[PDB]
Design a protein around this ligand. Structure first.
Ligand SMILES: *[C@@H]1O[C@H](CO)[C@@H](O[C@@H]2O[C@H](CO)[C@@H](O)[C@H](O)[C@H]2NC(C)=O)[C@H](O)[C@H]1NC(C)=O
Ligand SMILES: *[C@@H]1O[C@H](CO)[C@@H](O)[C@H](O)[C@H]1NC(C)=O
Ligand SMILES: *[C@@H]1O[C@H](CO)[C@@H](O)[C@H](O)[C@H]1NC(C)=O
Lengths: 49, 112
């Protein structure tokens, strides 16, 4: 699980753009304020290698 | 007394942010992910780092495909108040592969 892929919401990369966490770019409509339930936490995962 | 610039989106610098600093001996450049100050300082955690009035210094900044290009010119001048009436063309300094989103910026000056 040390190998990761980032997101699935609104804005998407320019060529050779890199993207990093600092605020929760959440996974739906509502603000989360650190919640990880519905609409919430980063859309960030790991591979089951 | 003017010495550099900060660029990025949030400018909290936890979020990645380009920093450019002249320190008279060198130009120093970084993309840092360390929380910067509320107000910049020049009293008399980064993914990339690099090191190199009667006058006017000019710079053009543009960011394309994660390449941050810089062009410049230096000249003498005889009016301090307004930009010079004549024609001159800036030449490329550097073409930096920094890979970051930019929408906001600020300038850095030396302090007593
Ligand atoms: C680059 O940074 C800007 C912020 O300065 C991002 O633009 C905002 O994106 C949100 C959605 O994530 C929109 O609701 C805002 O309206 C946008 N604001 C502006 C000023 O455009 C931009 O999305 C970032 N680039 C990428 C590819 O994520
Ligand atoms: C300028 O920065 C470099 C390291 O980036 C350092 O070696 C040098 O001594 C600095 N000069 C001054 C005057 O601070
Ligand atoms: C420090 O920078 C590295 C990448 O250069 C990053 O993985 C780490 O999350 C950063 N630390 C902080 C406090 O943001």
């Amino acid at each position: 699980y040390n190998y990761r892929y980032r997101l699935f919401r609104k804005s998407n990369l320019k060529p050779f753009e890199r993207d990093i966490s600092t605020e929760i770019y959440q996974a739906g409509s509502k603000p989360c304020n650190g919640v990880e339930g519905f609409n919430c936490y980063f859309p960030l995962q790991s591979y089951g290698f | 007394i003017i010495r550099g610039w900060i660029f990025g989106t949030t400018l909290d610098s936890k979020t990645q942010s380009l920093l450019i600093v002249n320190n008279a001996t060198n130009v120093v450049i970084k993309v840092c992910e360390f929380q910067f100050c509320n107000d910049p300082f020049l009293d008399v955690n980064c993914t990339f780092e690099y090191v190199s009035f009667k006058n006017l210094r000019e710079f053009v900044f543009k960011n394309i495909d994660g390449y941050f290009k810089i062009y410049s010119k230096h000249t003498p001048i005889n009016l301090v108040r307004d930009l010079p009436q004549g024609f001159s063309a800036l030449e490329p300094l550097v073409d930096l592969p920094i890979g970051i989103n930019i929408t906001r910026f600020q300038t850095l000056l030396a302090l007593h």
